[PDB]
Amino acid sequence: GVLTESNKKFLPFQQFGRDIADTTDAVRDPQTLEILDITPCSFGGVSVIT
């Protein structure tokens, strides 16, 4: 995905993060202890117009 810098705040023991759909949504940085969002890249079909 695109590791966008996050906005929300983790509890200072929580590593993972997920959504109502129960899939990976945010990740705390193991080194600098920062939180990052996630946004996958699968973007739509491709149609022709003639």
Binding site: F10, L11, I20, A26
Partner: protein
């Protein structure tokens, strides 16, 4: 002492894993403490005979709460049968820290490191075999002596799964003078123990002067709760959803 029971008013909630959520109601299935339970209250007000510290059968999780302010129960010895052939575990909150001493401790007929300092060597006699010893961070453990109102709610959850003996903890500064009142607050993890020993029973290492205190010993249960996180991501409510029809439909 005859343990006069009491009621557990919605206590014993703890973040079961590391995951974070937001404003979502999750329904988990873990070893929990049922609501409104009949907790085996150890009335530690001797000023009767709180020296009733058997090898309590360490069930699958024990809600070893404590409304104690001086940590009269400094330590907790663990093991299988406590007869000098067990790689036994001791969680001792001695002057240094909450030290985790897991070693082949040599027991006697009366297995306990009685205070005398834990010098009544009926557990530790020789460190012949020491797989690990997790000396934690040395904090301000100065032979805690403060008492009075049950302010430091030393609520403790002791579960042991797959060798990992996870100890959760929490301290909430609330004023109260008797058995667990109403209110809600979740517990957090404060240590995971990456060891591989087996535990069946345990003990409660009181600080011998019996003595005057107050603490409770429940017993967990493999139920299925339904948590409710919030915006800040903390547990603000839960429902033991095998208790009643209303709870079941919720």
């Amino acid at each position: 002492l005859p343990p006069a029971y009491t009621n557990s008013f919605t206590r014993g909630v703890y973040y079961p894993d590391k995951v974070f959520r937001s404003s979502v109601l999750h329904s988990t299935q873990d070893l929990f403490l049922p609501f409104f339970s009949n907790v085996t209250w150890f009335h530690a007000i001797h000023v009767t005979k709180r020296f009733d510290n058997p090898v309590l059968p360490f069930n699958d999780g024990v809600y070893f709460a404590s409304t104690e302010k001086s940590n009269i129960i400094r330590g907790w010895i663990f093991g299988t049968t406590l007869d000098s052939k067990t790689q036994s575990l001791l969680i001792v909150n001695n002057a240094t820290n909450v030290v985790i001493k897991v070693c082949e401790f040599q027991f006697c007929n009366d297995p306990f490191l009685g205070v005398y300092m834990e010098s009544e060597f009926r557990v530790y006699s020789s460190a012949n075999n020491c797989t690990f010893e997790y000396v934690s961070q040395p904090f301000l453990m100065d032979l805690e002596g403060k008492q009075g109102n049950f302010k430091n709610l030393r609520e403790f959850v002791f579960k042991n799964i797959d060798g990992y003996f996870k100890i959760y903890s929490k301290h909430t500064p609330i004023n109260l003078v008797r058995d667990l009142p109403q209110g809600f607050s979740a517990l957090e993890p404060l240590v995971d123990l990456p060891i591989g020993i087996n535990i069946t029973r345990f003990q409660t290492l009181l600080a011998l002067h019996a003595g005057a205190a107050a603490y409770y010993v429940g017993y967990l249960q493999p139920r299925t709760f339904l948590l409710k996180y919030n915006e800040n991501g903390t547990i603000t409510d839960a429902v033991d959803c095998a208790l009643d029809p209303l709870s079941e439909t919720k």
